[PDB]
Amino acid sequence: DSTDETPASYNLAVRRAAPAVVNVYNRGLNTNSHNQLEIRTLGSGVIMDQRGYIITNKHVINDADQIIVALQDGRVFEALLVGSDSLTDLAVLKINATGGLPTIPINARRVPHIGDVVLAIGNPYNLGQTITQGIISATGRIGLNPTGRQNFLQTDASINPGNSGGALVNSLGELMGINTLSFDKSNDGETPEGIGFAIPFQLATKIMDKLIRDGRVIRGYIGIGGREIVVNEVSPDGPAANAGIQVNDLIISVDNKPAISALETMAQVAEIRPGSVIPVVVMRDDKQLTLQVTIQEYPAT
Residue 67: is it exposed, middle or buried by C-beta count within 10 angstroms (0-12/13-18/19+)? buried
φ, ψ of residue 178 to 5 degrees: the values are -110, 115
* CB neighbourhood size of 241 (10 A): 15
Q: Would strands 250-254 and 277-283 be described as parallel, antiparallel, or unpaired?
A: antiparallel
Contacts 24+ apart (CB under 8 A), 187-194: 194/134, 194/137, 194/156, 194/158
Residues whose CB falls within 8 Å of the CB of residue 188, separated by 6 or more in sequence, listed in order: none
Give CA–CA dist 166/53, Å, rounded.
Answer: 14
HEC readout, 253-273? EECCEECCCHHHHHHHHHHCC
The H-or-E segment that residue 209 falls in is helix 201-213
Give CA–CA dist 135/2, Å, rounded.
Answer: 32
The H-or-E segment that residue 78 falls in is strand 76-78
DSSP reduced 3-state for 205: helix
DSSP reduced 3-state for 241: helix
For residues 251 and 235, the answer to whether their CB atoms sit within 8 Å is: no
Distance of CA 267 to the CA centre of its chain: 15
Q: Which of 44, 84, 137, 164 is catalytic?
A: 164
Q: Is the dihedral of CA 9, 11, 13, 18 positive or negative?
A: positive
Annotated binding site for substrate: 147, 222-227, 298
Question: What torsion, rounded to 10 degrees, do the Cα atoms 232, 228, 280, 263 define?
Answer: 110
Domains of the chain: 1-108+201-217 (2.40.10.10), 109-200 (2.40.10.10), 218-301 (2.30.42.10)
φ, ψ of residue 124 to 5 degrees: the values are -65, 130
Please report, as a single letter, which amino acid is at residue 218: I
Q: Which of 49, 59, 182, 235 is catalytic?
A: 59
Please report, as a single letter, which amino acid is at residue 245: I
Nearest to 54 by CA among 160, 193, 226, 175: 175
Q: Which of 89, 116, 137, 156 is catalytic?
A: 89
Give CA–CA dist 198/155, Å, rounded.
Answer: 8
Please report, as a single letter, which amino acid is at residue 22: V
Question: Nearest-5° angle of CA 113, CA 118, CA 124?
Answer: 140
Annotated binding site: 147, 222-227, 298
Please report, as a single letter, which amino acid is at residue 260: I
For residues 179 and 17, the answer to whether their CB atoms sit within 8 Å is: no
Q: Is 209 a catalytic residue?
A: no
Give CA–CA dist 136/24, Å, rounded.
Answer: 25
How far from 126 is each of 23, 44, 164, 175, 260, CA to CA, in Å?
Answer: 9, 10, 12, 22, 46
For residues 22 and 44, the answer to whether their CB atoms sit within 8 Å is: yes
φ, ψ of residue 39 to 5 degrees: the values are -75, 110
Q: Is 89 a catalytic residue?
A: yes
Give CA–CA dist 26/9, Å, rounded.
Answer: 34
Residues in the chain: 301
Q: Is 34 a catalytic residue?
A: no
